[PDB]
Amino acid sequence: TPSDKPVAHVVANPQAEGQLQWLNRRANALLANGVELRDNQLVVPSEGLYLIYSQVLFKGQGCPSTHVLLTHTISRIAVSYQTKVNLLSAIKSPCQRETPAKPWYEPIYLGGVFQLEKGDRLSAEINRPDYLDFAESGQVYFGIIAL
Amino acid sequence: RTPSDKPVAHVVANPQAEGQLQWLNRRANALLANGVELRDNQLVVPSEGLYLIYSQVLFKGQGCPHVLLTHTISRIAVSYQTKVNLLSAIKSPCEAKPWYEPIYLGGVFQLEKGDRLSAEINRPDYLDFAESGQVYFGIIAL
Amino acid sequence: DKPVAHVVANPEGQLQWLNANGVELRDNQLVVPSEGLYLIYSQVLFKGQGCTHVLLTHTISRIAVQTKVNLLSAIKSPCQREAKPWYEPIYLGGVFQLEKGDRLSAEINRPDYLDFGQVYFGIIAL
Numbered sequence: 261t262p263s264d265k266p267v268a269h270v271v272a273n274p275q276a277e278g279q280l281q282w283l284n285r286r287a288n289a290l291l292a293n294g295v296e297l298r299d300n301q302l303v304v305p306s307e308g309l310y311l312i313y314s315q316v317l318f319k320g321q322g323c324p325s326t327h328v329l330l331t332h333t334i335s336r337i338a339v340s341y342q343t344k345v346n347l348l349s350a351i352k353s354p355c356q357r358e359t360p361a362k363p364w365y366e367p368i369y370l371g372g373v374f375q376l377e378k379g380d381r382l383s384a385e386i387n388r389p390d391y392l393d394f395a396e397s398g399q400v401y402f403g404i405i406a407l
Numbered sequence: 408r409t410p411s412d413k414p415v416a417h418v419v420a421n422p423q424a425e426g427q428l429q430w431l432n433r434r435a436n437a438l439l440a441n442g443v444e445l446r447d448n449q450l451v452v453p454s455e456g457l458y459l460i461y462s463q464v465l466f467k468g469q470g471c472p473h474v475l476l477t478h479t480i481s482r483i484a485v486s487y488q489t490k491v492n493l494l495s496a497i498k499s500p501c502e503a504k505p506w507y508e509p510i511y512l513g514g515v516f517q518l519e520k521g522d523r524l525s526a527e528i529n530r531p532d533y534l535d536f537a538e539s540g541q542v543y544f545g546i547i548a549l
Numbered sequence: 550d551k552p553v554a555h556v557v558a559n560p561e562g563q564l565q566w567l568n569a570n571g572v573e574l575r576d577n578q579l580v581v582p583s584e585g586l587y588l589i590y591s592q593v594l595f596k597g598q599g600c601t602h603v604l605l606t607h608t609i610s611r612i613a614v615q616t617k618v619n620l621l622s623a624i625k626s627p628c629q630r631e632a633k634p635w636y637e638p639i640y641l642g643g644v645f646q647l648e649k650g651d652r653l654s655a656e657i658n659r660p661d662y663l664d665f666g667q668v669y670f671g672i673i674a675l
């Protein structure tokens with residue numbers, strides 16, 4: 261008998277270069293037991309503890325003049341407070357200095373366990389989609405597992 | 408009430424398989440239960456359904472010299488016969504001070520009877536086996 | 550129905566777990582109430598205020614009823630060099646056959662670096 265636990269693993273659309281579009285319709289991506297992907301946001305079907313997790317990968321060929329600051333954030337939009345509450349966040353400076361030009365790879369991973377309500381809208385956002393790496397699949401994903 | 412019918416696996420790396428990330432099930436605290444097979448370094452699924460899938464690898468380099476470390480979990484379905492990646496991480500880490508990069512990949516997936524999950528790296532030379540529990544691969548049916 | 554625990558860190562000098570089904574928490578360790586398959590997991594977060602070559606280790610070990618052994622373990626190294634802040638999480642998790650009365654500890658080498666949803670330890674019976 262299949263599991264009744266809400267789950268979801270959405271992935272970046274690799275053709276949507278310049279955005280971070282989460283897909284559920286894509287091979288090895290998934291929504292189940294009530295979880296929805298609406299408006300680039302996961303929608304929690306029922307209260308409980310969820311494991312939330314996301315990976316994003318950044319890439320640049322060399323370091324430019326302006327300082328590069330990469331951020332990744334999992335936000336929450338509750339029905340009783342319909343403004344983004346940050347759940348998880350992290351920030352990486354992949355460049356110490358400007359190149360006087362080998363390629364760099366900055367992943368950002370966020371995971372934790374949080375209490376969610378029914379109708380919670382979860383988003384996972386980055387500041388610089390132009391540095392996202394869609395070179396092969398599996399690298400950029402966002403997902404939840406009810407515990 | 409009784410023991411669990413759920414398919415599961417937790418396989419561990421062989422520290423003396425050179426140039427290989429060789430997964431093993433016959434070890435203490437390792438495990439293949441309820442139809443999960445380890446076949447050609449690939450865990451094989453016995454039933455359709457939702458599974459958690461996870462792997463840890465830990466690389467270590469004594470200092471730096473352009474180093475890239477990749478860790479990749481991938482699916483082959485009976486039906487499609489194509490090797491698709493499920494989760495993937497690329498990392499550039501760089502006396503000579505020793506560095507450590509753990510890479511933990513995990514997620515929830517919808518698998519089909521007879522899929523062949525595999526967990527791989529680009530650089531086995533950089534694997535660390537300092538202690539036990541450092542390098543591993545498994546699935547857990549929900 | 551099934552044994553479960555989710556314990557978290559108290560926000561000095563100790564990673565101490567705080568607080569439920571069949572599962573006790575004697576002496577900073579989860580105590581398995583019966584034989585079977587368990588999904589054991591944890592996370593911890595280290596933060597530095599700027600960087601002694603430091604290695605942050607996090608380890609979940611089984612104390613089987615009579616020795617003590619690593620189940621899951623990782624080492625991070627935050628600094629490549631000797632005042633910018635850094636954050637470094639370590640993730641552990643996997644599925645394990647276990648005995649009634651086994652103890653599961655989740656430890657760190659440097660409590661001094663710990664930065665107290667990101668610092669937990671738990672189990673779930675399958």
Ligand SMILES: Cc1ccc(C)c(Cn2c([C@@H](O)c3ccncc3)nc3ccccc32)c1
Nearest residue numbers: 311313371459461513514590591640641642
């Ligand atoms: C997504 C996923 C799939 C399978 C497993 C076994 C895990 C490991 N896990 C962890 C933590 O180590 C973690 C978190 C985020 N991403 C990677 C690891 N925290 C957990 C809490 C509950 C269950 C498994 C938990 C995580």
Ligand SMILES: [Cl-]
Nearest residue numbers: 538539618619
């Ligand atoms: Cl050990």
